Ligand binder design. Structure first.
Ligand SMILES: Nc1ncnc2c1ncn2[C@@H]1O[C@H](COP(=O)(O)OP(=O)(O)O)[C@@H](O)[C@H]1O
Ligand SMILES: Nc1ncnc2c1ncn2[C@@H]1O[C@H](COP(=O)(O)OP(=O)(O)O)[C@@H](O)[C@H]1O
Ligand SMILES: Nc1ncnc2c1ncn2[C@@H]1O[C@H](COP(=O)(O)OP(=O)(O)O)[C@@H](O)[C@H]1O
Ligand SMILES: Nc1ncnc2c1ncn2[C@@H]1O[C@H](COP(=O)(O)OP(=O)(O)O)[C@@H](O)[C@H]1O
Ligand SMILES: Nc1ncnc2c1ncn2[C@@H]1O[C@H](COP(=O)(O)OP(=O)(O)O)[C@@H](O)[C@H]1O
Ligand SMILES: [Mg+2]
Ligand SMILES: [Mg+2]
Ligand SMILES: [Mg+2]
Ligand SMILES: [Mg+2]
Ligand SMILES: [Mg+2]
Lengths: 371, 371, 371, 371, 371
């Protein structure tokens, strides 16, 4: 029975079974192919590496991410990852369980529809349902009210929910996200001669970022103190033993989330995106949202980012509004956790879209709405 | 002598001279600033683009509209546009002529007062008068009786006038207008992967809308026929040569005017706003208003919108009431045209507020009433 | 008065005076040292050969290029070349003139800073300014808009500029360049027994390349026709009189620019690097960039390379976009020419960084931005 | 059935049958001709001695090596040696078996093609395949990852292989090898009056080298200790009974591999050639290569050479990188052993190029790639 | 002051003073001892004849040459000749002057060291320096670039020098030289009954050779014409009045230099030795060497030898290479002349090895290198 929860994000694939409080399979949504050599099978050499093994043999592969900015672009590779997810990672035969999928709001309708088709035809998934990540994030936090600030790898978005009701009219979405932060950092590391150009190296820079980068509480001030050599500098050991010294970049990188323009992004920073979404909501609600900002996973894992936003939102908001940011430990899996909850949830059972229904109605059925 | 007619709307600035039957200067109320680069003058690089040149170099500018929802918010940029209007567009020295301004009803009093101050101090305008757009619209149509339905970019409003008398007690005003329609359309275009996020792209979407969108006579029915691929689909070529295919959005966008809730707007659709305004009028007048609905400019330019409202008002009204909607060609400049007429009108001459009077009485003088 | 223009590239040093339309001193950035013998001075034997004399006596020297991939690595030898440039080549006493330097974008900050220090301390250069090569290239072409495709010896890079504004957010940079092409060719010449291993021989292969190699319009097709002995074969006389016959290599070498993977380079070919840089620009600009691609110097000197890219970009671009590649004669000195123009340019005068300023502010001053 | 493994090197010919763990025929690739006398057959005097008999009667022959620097130069004599190999040494009729040949990387294409022609036409070899020596060396060591350092008689080369994939982009090749070491030693022996000038004597010096020479762990230091008469001196008995005393030369000879310049070679020593090849590989691989350097045969047989390189590579590498050099006993036949393995390998069977295929496609067929 | 120049060759001793353009003492390096008689002093009969007096009384002496193949073998007699050189020939007291010695390249180190010891201990030579003959030969010719072809009595050798730099890596050395030519000729004269077996007679044959022998431009052709009695025959009068007729031998003798094998020499002829030495040099140099071959003394005095080599080198070389052989009159003293120049040369002064230095450092000091 149970159910599968598959948070097929743009960065990491988080899969597991309903009822568990943690993902069982967490691995990079990556399909790698022998960068060079051509590679005739000959003996038995495969030309396809997925997830952890692509990381292991990263040095000979060109790594691709099927999903870009929250949208599945390379469907062949996407299908491949799902295949791998079920059989090689979870070790489960798809048709045993109904599957709960997730996605970012404001995606192309074809994203849902094509994904749906595959679930029902390639994997023969008894029944399937695609939920919105923001909703799930609140379930994880145990809230019915708040601003969900999702921000990881491909997509950043804001969803206002009030006492169980979604306020779709104020959804915000940015391309700013972890992947942009990574690439920005690559560009910045170059300032010190640390040239990174390969997809392998990009991947390394992701690892650098996740170890050293953090959010400043006052970018300008801290940046100024960085003029003096100090604790702001911290080293990193590369795979080949070469040691890197990181300085300003350690906080300049994540700062992009607050100052978009760093990468040529025209939009406003996440604190204003959040604030404005609240401004687009009814005045009787605004207060409740101010005291219940809920950070999801991904890039919200930077140290001190909660405090930084608390500061800036407080500045933007009215002085009597209590600004409080919810940013629990394990929020990196917030969506997946919510999925587990929802899937195990009793009444939710009626929401499954059976293959039967799909065959009867066709693709359009996935756009039905209900909690 | 003559006079200047300056229909300083929220979307387009329409300026010209009294007596002409068409605006001489029609350009976007836009102030653009180099999105990125910082831009030290250095050689002679300016950091300020207004109107047509902001459109021309749109790709490197962050475009701002000084006016929002009919209210001047960025006064610095507003002043700048007026400067540009007089010297760069009309090529006229302000102090030569008295100036006729316009605005939406129910604006903040400070809007009038601050605007007034600028006219008299920055531009030294001999004498100035601020009229209400609805009144002017009827002058353009040659009517003394009717419901003026103004609806363009920032403001939609209803004003009942009967045989030369204004009925201020039944004025309606909505935030629904062209700019909301544009942004809704952006949100909807996303359904097909047509991501538009920049102010430049917003501007493009405005152009899309103005070419392809039209009003359905029966939204539900037409929307249903759109299930079959047909003539409802129509393509559009983007600035970079990429081709867009528009389907449902082609009529779903303008439909928002009839179903507000599409963008989270709580108010009733324009056909009910109109109807209700008539209901708030004396029963002896109602009949005359029913047969004389006058559409102003802006969004009333959508194809078939007159017929659509005729239908719905007919449904709302009594069966014996002849419902007739006046929606002349060139109504996109209705207000401006009326301004030209009124300014050239003999007796109107007494209405000018001289700088002398202003200096004697102060700001409050602009709230005097007379036809 | 005047000014010195010193395009200190990785391959050739191009120096001259502002106002001239051609470099006065063009010579190889090479420092050679007696390969063997040890060489005690004894009588008066020097152990240091720079530029043309290193070429002349190439046969007994190990030739080094101080600059690698656009970065100054051997600062001692770099200083030496500059010394030579001023006194032995230009025959000018540095302190007479302000100096305009150039470099590739995305270099290590220390490259600028150390270079700066030397100018002010070793050569006592009154005032100095370091410009970006791409900007200069457009000046040479007389354009304010276009994609600069720089590609010579150490660095290939793409810079988008629009109507005087730089779009730094879409700068691309590759290690692929002339030096890699040379070394690839060495590796390929080996196929016919033409073993080249010395730095002297590398230098010869550079000369081979510059005489015989050209860009195919259809690599696959031409390569196929090369199966038949024909005009594709062309001979070359080595310094010792031995005659070489070149076949496939004549176009396989430069083809690497379009197919990176030939040398194990992971990145995309220059036509996609260019295209993608344009894709990273605002959609309102893209069109203007498509019709204004500007090839700089270096490797763009291969025959037919303009036509080849025109073809491939046309394939990549939308069918309505007019693809036009600007690739003027004398583009091999494009940057230097632009430097001459800019240095002579009136308003530019304010940009000089005086030694005074440097002493007051310190190294960081060279990162100030302005046109 | 089985297969023939013929490691036709430049020094020794190693031939045997697939499945054996050792060569059956190991003899010098030498063709000797009566140095003087002219030699009319008369009675039955032959003018051609091959291999062991050329060594036996070395004193009256001018000895030639058909192969020079890995390239077959004297094809007539090459054919002769192969004839001898099959009939006089192995005692096998060629057409019984498919033949596995080997060669150094980066050879002239004509080397493969002409060799191929002979196999199919002179010897009528059912099917034949030419493999690269480096690959075979790893098979012998049982590894799928490592740096193959091949260095014997005519060719020294470096090939990086990672988990079954070849990284051709970082292949290095030097002319430095055993034959150069021999000739250098001849030149050096002259210092003590030991004049060796004949090809016979060269051959003797080869034997001297193989008995006495070894690699210093610290050349400078050891060389200094050699100032004192000691155990560094060791004697050798010549064929005529004359006794030689060897001193410094005992380690100065092999030192050339680390200091090229000793013989006027411009290239870097083998420890830097190795290191640099690793530097040309992806950073995620480098570590694995550092701990898996695999020495092939030939000159790697010098005593302590593994330890010497371990030292110098350790100096070059990062301190955290575990440097380990694999240099097994019997590595002098590494390639041949690998050949035996590969030939017996099941799936490899498909790789044979049948004479049929050759006749159909022609010479070019030998450049097909597959494992 | 001045200096002594002592070209202590294997055939003739050429001694004189620095600054002179010709040797003052030129005499045979011969020590003769009463062949028979025993010779007790008795009255005052000496048992030791050196140089000219050994020639005068040649008929009763067994003549020995202390030097063989460029190596001093009989040190007792060597010392004796030097004694004679200084006191009996030059008439100078050694200690008055510093002494410049010469030797062939690739000699045993003990040759230099023992010679050195004697200079400092037996003759108390203030300071001494041992130069290489090839270098000196170029000084005589006034060149800094060329192939020195030295070939006289004991040693033939090739040294490449380029613009003041020695290229030791391509030095060639043969035992073929005048003494071998003499002995070959003795063996050949026997064909006509002219038996020569004594050292006295050997000496006569040397004189025959120097009068009649010459180099053929086409050995085969000329040899064929010698079938007819002609001008090729030429007579010689022996010391006892007996007349010799020389025919084929007149050119067969010197031909050995081009065809080594005539005396059982395995090496290649001097034209190939020269050519190959050039081939071992860098390709950028080869051309300069081709046009600057410099013949030293000794056997290069044969008539037409320059033309003969020009022919054969031209055949070996590329058709575009201008082959030019420098073979000036008085080249028989080339080395000595160069010595005079160098010794008088200003800067050279620093090169003298003082006895002081020798006593401090010991023998090894003579292997220091510098020009
Ligand atoms: N400790 C960390 N600090 C900062 N960012 C992190 C950290 N861990 C992960 N990330 C970022 O989050 C991204 C993926 O997180 P996730 O929320 O699972 O993305 P998605 O749901 O879009 O797949 C990573 O690619 C990385 O950029
Ligand atoms: N052909 C058209 N169809 C539909 N809408 C239009 C058309 N032309 C203009 N508009 C809308 O009208 C807006 C401005 O019209 P206008 O009445 O001048 O506005 P305002 O008076 O508020 O400045 C435009 O921004 C656009 O949204
Ligand atoms: N005729 C030519 N054809 C092709 N490539 C050329 C030609 N001339 C020069 N080059 C290449 O351009 C390189 C240097 O050009 P340049 O643009 O001055 O380099 P840089 O500015 O990096 O110093 C040369 O090293 C050579 O590789
Ligand atoms: N014990 C030894 N020590 C050092 N070098 C050796 C030894 N044995 C052989 N060699 C060198 O290896 C050379 C040939 O080895 P091999 O690897 O078979 O050469 P190739 O494969 O090129 O024919 C010999 O000519 C000799 O120079
Ligand atoms: N005219 C000549 N023709 C040919 N060979 C000569 C002539 N004169 C001298 N030689 C040869 O040169 C030899 C010595 O010349 P030289 O160059 O001084 O020898 P070395 O320098 O070795 O002492 C003589 O022994 C003789 O063999
Ligand atoms: Mg996510
Ligand atoms: Mg209006
Ligand atoms: Mg350049
Ligand atoms: Mg081998
Ligand atoms: Mg001599």
């Amino acid at each position: 029975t149970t159910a599968l929860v598959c948070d097929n994000g743009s960065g990491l694939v988080k899969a597991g079974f309903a009822g568990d409080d943690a993902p069982r399979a967490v691995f990079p949504s990556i399909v790698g192919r022998p960068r060079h050599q051509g590679v005739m099978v000959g003996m038995g050499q495969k030309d396809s590496y997925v997830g952890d093994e692509a990381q292991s043999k990263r040095g000979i592969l060109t790594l691709k991410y099927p999903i870009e900015h929250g949208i599945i672009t390379n469907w062949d590779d996407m299908e491949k990852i799902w295949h791998h997810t079920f059989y090689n990672e979870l070790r489960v035969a798809p048709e045993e369980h109904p599957t709960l999928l997730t996605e970012a709001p404001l995606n192309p309708k074809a994203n849902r529809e094509k994904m749906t088709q595959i679930m029902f035809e390639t994997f023969n998934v008894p029944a399937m349902y695609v939920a919105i990540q923001a909703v799930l994030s609140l379930y994880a936090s145990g809230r019915t009210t708040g601003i969900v600030l999702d921000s990881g790898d491909g997509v950043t978005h804001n969803v206002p929910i009030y006492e169980g009701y979604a306020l779709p009219h104020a959804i915000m979405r940015l391309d700013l996200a972890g992947r942009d932060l990574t690439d920005y950092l690559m560009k910045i590391l170059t300032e010190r001669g640390y040239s990174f150009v390969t997809t392998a190296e990009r991947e390394i820079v992701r690892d650098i970022k996740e170890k050293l980068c953090y959010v400043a509480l006052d970018f300008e001030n801290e940046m100024a103190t960085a003029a003096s050599s100090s604790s702001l500098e911290k080293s990193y050991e590369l795979p080949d033993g070469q040691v890197i010294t990181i300085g300003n970049e350690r906080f300049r990188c994540p700062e992009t989330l607050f100052q978009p323009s760093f990468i040529g992004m025209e939009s406003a920073g996440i604190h204003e995106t959040t604030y404005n979404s609240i401004m687009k909501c009814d005045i009787d609600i605004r207060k409740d949202l101010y005291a219940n900002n809920v950070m999801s996973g991904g890039t919200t894992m930077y140290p001190g980012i909660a405090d930084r936003m608390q500061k800036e939102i407080t500045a933007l908001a009215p002085s009597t509004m209590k600004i409080k940011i919810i940013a629990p430990p394990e929020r990196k899996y917030s969506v997946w956790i919510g999925g587990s909850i929802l899937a195990s949830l009793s009444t939710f059972q009626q929401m499954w879209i059976t293959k039967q229904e799909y065959d009867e109605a066709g693709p359009s059925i996935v756009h039905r709405k209900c909690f």
